[PDB]
Amino acid sequence: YFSPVMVLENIEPEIVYAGYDSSKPDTAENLLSTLNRLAGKQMIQVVKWAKVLPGFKNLPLEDQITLIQYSWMSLSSFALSWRSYKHTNSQFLYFAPDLVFNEEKMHQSAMYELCQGMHQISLQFVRLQLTFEEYTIMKVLLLLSTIPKDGLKSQAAFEEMRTNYIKELRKMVTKSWQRFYQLTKLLDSMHDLVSDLLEFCFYTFRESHALKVEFPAMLVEIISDQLPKVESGNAKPLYFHRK
Numbered sequence: 363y364f365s366p367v368m369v370l371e372n373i374e375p376e377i378v379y380a381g382y383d384s385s386k387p388d389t390a391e392n393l394l395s396t397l398n399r400l401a402g403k404q405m406i407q408v409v410k411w412a413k414v415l416p417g418f419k420n421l422p423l424e425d426q427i428t429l430i431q432y433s434w435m436s437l438s439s440f441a442l443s444w445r446s447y448k449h450t451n452s453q454f455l456y457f458a459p460d461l462v463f464n465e466e467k468m469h470q471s472a473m474y475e476l477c478q479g480m481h482q483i484s485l486q487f488v489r490l491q492l493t494f495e496e497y498t499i500m501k502v503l504l505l506l507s508t509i510p511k512d513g514l515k516s517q518a519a520f521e522e523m524r525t526n527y528i529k530e531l532r533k534m535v536t537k538s539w540q541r542f543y544q545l546t547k548l549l550d551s552m553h554d555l556v557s558d559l560l561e562f563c564f565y566t567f568r569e570s571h572a573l574k575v576e577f578p579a580m581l582v583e584i585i586s587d588q589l590p591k592v593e594s595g596n597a598k599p600l601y602f603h604r605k
């Protein structure tokens with residue numbers, strides 16, 4: 363099929379500023395609008411990374427779009443836990459160099475309990491001493507962790523790519539079975555947090571002007587397609603270990 367991990371380490375996206383206006387009042391509407399603008403910028407970076415991701419080109423265009431749309435919150439959350447861990451030792455939520463959440467911002471964002479759930483994942487990075495190599499393989503597994511209920515157009519092609527990245531994670535943990543299951547348990551726990559993040563995101567999207575929450579064009583497109591699929595139960599989370 364294929365070291366692809368050496369490739370993963372080099373294709374990691376550059377740093378993205380939030381463009382946060384600290385002179386503006388710290389309302390839920392202003393903070394969430396800034397987070398949505400940041401999410402739009404990260405999405406462009408995800409597409410650029412996915413195009414050069416080994417094996418991703420083999421999947422048909424329709425499947426590539428489905429995977430990116432279904433996994434956007436999973437990839438975003440996981441990357442947030444990594445930045446929080448790397449830059450603050452998981453003491454704060456490191457959204458961007460210019461946007462680091464303390465207790466105050468967690469309350470102001472009107473997402474306090476969700477922010478705490480996210481901080482719990484970053485605390486697991488500290489407990490496990492997650493490595494950058496482990497992190498890059500796991501991010502690929504998250505891109506390949508949610509599919510349509512009726513499968514993808516090229517299901518066999520997808521399964522081959524996913525299986526090969528799982529083999530890469532197993533090879534990596536040796537540098538071992540105990541660590542492999544600690545990492546798969548961490549990946550599985552991403553689905554529950556992402557579910558709660560999407561529930562709130564769908565809510566603010568469906569009544570955005572009523573709460574003054576702005577969404578960039580990229581998020582409008584992704585959410586408009588994803589929202590009816592997720593609520594109709596057409597999304598299928600892939601678990602290593604069924605709950």
Ligand SMILES: CNC(=O)C[C@H]1COc2cc(F)ccc2N1C(=O)c1ccc2c(c1)NC(=O)CO2
Nearest residue numbers: 394397400401438439442476477480562563566
């Ligand atoms: C730009 N963002 C990120 O870097 C990280 C990502 C995903 O992990 C999150 C965790 C968290 F604790 C708070 C926010 C986010 N992030 C979000 O983008 C997001 C999620 C839900 C939303 C919104 C954003 N926006 C809304 O209007 C309301 O629902």
